[PDB]
Design a protein around this ligand. Structure first.
Ligand SMILES: *[C@@H]1O[C@H](CO)[C@@H](O)[C@H](O)[C@H]1NC(C)=O
Ligand SMILES: *[C@@H]1O[C@H](CO)[C@@H](O)[C@H](O)[C@H]1NC(C)=O
Ligand SMILES: *[C@@H]1O[C@H](CO)[C@@H](O)[C@H](O)[C@H]1NC(C)=O
Ligand SMILES: *[C@@H]1O[C@H](CO)[C@@H](O)[C@H](O)[C@H]1NC(C)=O
Ligand SMILES: *[C@@H]1O[C@H](CO)[C@@H](O)[C@H](O)[C@H]1NC(C)=O
Lengths: 596, 195
């Protein structure tokens, strides 16, 4: 028996063993998140401890079959992902050092409290206390107080921890034969040994920078119009040529400019399409929402939801004494078991969230037939992208009218169109520079290109130059403002949101051409179109079995990420913005700061 | 007249594991076969050769009742000329099979919150089974070239694997009780003229 055949037998043992052990970990995790008790915390931990231990044992055994002697690629994939040492390439001491650092940064982010001056008892946490301020407040000094207090009382705690976390994570990565820890994250997109579908770790950097160059014009005009509208609101706080103050962006980091809509709305007399009043008018409940989501997927030739889905999910808040973690999530417990956890309410936003989460499920049912190790999105951005394009088609007036929530006596006019695209752009476009800028800074720290003594100097030089955003208070090297963001201090790769956004419009553009949709891309609903459905299903069922370059070709027909459909979606806005900025300055000077 | 003890086969408290499938020979009795067909209580009822319509008139030497438990997706393997981990390593039907396959979902009985590990199957075997062969061995499967010394090790696995039936499983993963009826026609008495 060859090294390949023994491996085919070793994977056979693993796949059956892991499947039941993962099902037991996931099931305990569900009984806690739906029933927050102390006994369910211990049972979630013991079952999660057993699952983590099984993997570490199998990862060691899988390392005993050398990949060099394997040729069947669908086996080398299952072997490689299992052999990934991760932190287990370090010494027991350095792994224990690193995991303690990872916890303290997580504890500091979550328990970080800031207390207002002259009352050391009226303290606030980030969530909800500080987040409420950064999202709703229009007072400059209150918003300024939260922004700085958060970074000064909590970010500084993280600065020494992050310094030692970069040295260790680079050590782990360099021991896994990567350049640095940033090169290690870029490994998510790597593809080798497939003639015509390969993709290198450095190729991601070049592709991100390249596609970002084409987003720049749209962002500059959106930046110039947001500045112009904010300037009217805060006349003595915003320069007509300078960057935007970081505490005035609608949240704590300026990740999403969504909450600026109230001041930047182009036509503030035409109301939003809020079909929520029509949902209460028609006595809808949570089940009706998800039933209507089911009919959507069925309309395009997808399978309906399993009986176990309707019986096991938690689509309504358990209320009363039984407490639950209300964050919407989709659950692929394996073994024919699929669920959705969601404290749904009769609103339009939850109606759209139901379509976003049931999309994750259809992705999970499609690749369920794959081996255990390949039951995931083609890459990190695939899973999140498929979920977003559901809310796109579902939210259109073409679709909301077809399901009886929007009056047929409502017709889309070119003003509400611009209102819509602007609010989408505030959320979709604004985060693209924030995300590229953040991850580029991290890639440069890991690569060594940023000395410890210029960490915050380069963070804000790159906020001004790339994002067009300037810090309202000068920060020395005792701060750690990137780590004041959840993903940074909790060790998550951030480029997944950049590619996801570019993906989700490539998807939506190809499905809307399959569905033979006519008109602007943003008006498209892929309902009742089984041609579109078949074109997406050919990729969903792949899971991780094939390179993400090929899986992407099955939906769109292109082997690589591409920003054009994103621009295509937004062109009606882009044309209107350029006309609004004819008598305004488009661009920003990086030397201006609000502290003179 | 003797009534054929079918109430014992279908209504048994506990079925056998598919690797150790259970056979019960039926002889010298009367089988009102039509009761089983007409009863709307079975999900799979496909017969091969004989006809289930109303052929409870023909005589047979011996009738063999084989009963085990498998998961719902594997029911397709209980058919002539099928491939799979059940049809190759646990319970194989010949190409010329003459008889019937009866199956029903037993999630209320054989599933337990937390997992019922009573039922097993064989996951590895040196070779495929002959039709109607049974292997209950517990010898450690040698996957590599190093002898296993009777203990689980590298390239040395225990050959039988458990199901773990939980009531929340998808139907493709839920317990199904199977009953396979073989109809022997030797040049012999013919003692089972059910009607
Ligand atoms: C959750 O566990 C508590 C025990 O603290 C129990 O009172 C309650 O019935 C459980 N909820 C469910 C849905 O089983
Ligand atoms: C790879 O192995 C699987 C079984 O493990 C087999 O079904 C598949 O055809 C193989 N592919 C190639 C190209 O040999
Ligand atoms: C995994 O760790 C082992 C040490 O136990 C080492 O042989 C191997 O180089 C490591 N593999 C990778 C890919 O870093
Ligand atoms: C799903 O569709 C099948 C038909 O293919 C039907 O038997 C089943 O009842 C349907 N279930 C739901 C919840 O739509
Ligand atoms: C199984 O038990 C039920 C309940 O008494 C009975 O009506 C049925 O006939 C039994 N099955 C057979 C095959 O006799």
């Amino acid at each position: 028996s060859t090294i390949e055949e023994q491996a085919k037998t070793f994977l056979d043992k693993f796949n059956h063993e892991a499947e039941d052990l993962f099902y037991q970990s996931s099931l305990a995790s569900w009984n806690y998140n739906t029933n927050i008790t102390e006994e369910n915390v211990q049972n979630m931990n013991n079952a999660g401890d057993k699952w983590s231990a099984f993997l570490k044992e199998q990862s060691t055994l899988a390392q005993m079959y050398p990949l060099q002697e394997i040729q069947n690629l669908t086996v080398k994939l299952q072997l490689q992902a299992l052999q990934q040492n991760g932190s287990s390439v370090l010494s027991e001491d350095k792994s224990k050092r690193l995991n303690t650092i990872l916890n303290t940064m997580s504890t500091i982010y979550s328990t970080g409290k800031v207390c207002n001056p002259d009352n050391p008892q009226e303290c606030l946490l980030l969530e909800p206390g500080l987040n409420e301020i950064m999202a709703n407040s229009l007072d400059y000094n209150e918003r300024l107080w939260a922004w700085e207090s958060w970074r000064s009382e909590v970010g500084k705690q993280l600065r020494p921890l992050y310094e030692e976390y970069v040295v260790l994570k680079n050590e782990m990565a360099r021991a896994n034969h990567y350049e640095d820890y940033g090169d290690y994250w870029r490994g998510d997109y790597e593809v080798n040994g497939v003639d015509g579908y390969d993709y290198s770790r450095g190729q991601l950097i070049e592709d991100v920078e390249h596609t970002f160059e084409e987003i720049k014009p749209l962002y500059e005009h959106l930046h110039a119009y947001v500045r112009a509208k904010l300037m009217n609101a805060y006349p003595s706080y915003i320069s007509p040529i300078g960057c935007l103050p970081a505490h005035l962006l609608g949240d704590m980091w300026g990740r999403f400019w969504t909450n600026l809509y109230s001041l930047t709305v182009p036509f503030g007399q035409k109301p939003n399409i809020d079909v929520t009043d029509a949902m209460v008018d028609q006595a809808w409940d949570a089940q009706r929402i998800f039933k209507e989501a089911e009919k959507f997927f069925v309309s395009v030739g997808l399978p309906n939801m399993t009986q176990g889905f309707w019986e096991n999910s938690m689509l309504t808040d358990p209320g009363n004494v039984q407490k639950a973690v209300c964050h919407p999530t989709a659950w692929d417990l394996g073994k024919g078991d699929f669920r959705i956890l969601m404290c749904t309410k009769v609103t339009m936003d939850d109606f759209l969230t139901a379509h976003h989460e049931m999309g994750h499920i259809q992705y999970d049912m499609a690749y369920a037939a794959q081996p255990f190790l390949l039951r995931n999105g083609a890459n990190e951005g695939f899973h999140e992208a498929v979920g977003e394009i559901m809310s796109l088609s579902a939210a259109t007036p073409k679709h909301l009218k077809s399901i009886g929530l929007l009056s047929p006596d409502f017709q889309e006019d070119n003003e509400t169109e611009i209102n819509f695209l602007l609010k989408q752009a505030l959320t979709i476009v604004g985060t693209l520079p924030f995300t590229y800028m953040l991850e580029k800074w991290r890639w440069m720290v890991f690569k060594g290109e940023i000395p410890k003594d210029q960490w915050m100097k380069k963070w804000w030089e790159m906020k001004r130059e790339i994002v067009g955003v300037v810090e309202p208070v000068p920060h020395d090297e005792t701060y750690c403002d990137p780590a004041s963001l959840f993903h940074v201090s909790n060790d998550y790769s951030f480029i997944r949101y950049y590619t996801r956004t570019l993906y989700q419009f490539q998807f939506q553009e190809a499905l809307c051409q399959a569905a033979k949709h006519e008109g602007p891309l943003h008006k498209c609903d892929i309902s009742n179109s089984t041609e579109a459905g078949q074109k997406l299903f050919n990729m969903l069922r792949l899971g991780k079995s094939e390179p993400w370059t090929l899986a992407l070709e099955n939906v769109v027909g292109a082997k690589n990420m591409n920003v054009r459909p994103l621009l295509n979606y937004f062109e009606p806005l882009f044309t209107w913005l350029k006309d609004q900025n004819k008598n305004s300055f488009v661009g920003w000077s990086t030397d201006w700061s609000p502290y003179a | 007249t003797n009534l054929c003890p079918f109430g014992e086969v279908f209504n048994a408290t506990r079925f056998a594991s598919v690797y150790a499938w259970n056979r019960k020979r039926i002889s010298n009795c009367v089988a009102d076969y039509s009761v089983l067909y007409n009863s709307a209580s079975f999900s799979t009822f496909k017969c091969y050769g004989v006809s289930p319509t109303k052929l409870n008139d023909l005589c047979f030497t011996n009738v063999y009742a084989d009963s085990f438990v498998i998961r719902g997706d594997e029911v397709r393997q209980i058919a002539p000329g099928q491939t799979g981990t059940i049809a190759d390593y646990n319970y194989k039907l010949p190409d010329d099979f003459t008889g019937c396959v009866i199956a029903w979902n037993s999630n209320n009985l054989d599933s337990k919150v937390g997992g019922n590990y009573n039922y097993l199957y064989r996951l590895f075997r040196k070779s495929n089974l002959k039709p109607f062969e049974r292997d209950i061995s517990t010898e450690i499967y040698q996957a590599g070239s190093t002898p296993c010394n009777g203990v689980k090790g590298f390239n040395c696995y225990f050959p039988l694997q458990s199901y773990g039936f939980q009531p929340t499983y998808g139907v493709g993963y839920q317990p199904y009780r199977v009953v396979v009826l073989s109809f022997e026609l030797l040049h012999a008495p013919a003692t089972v003229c059910g009607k």
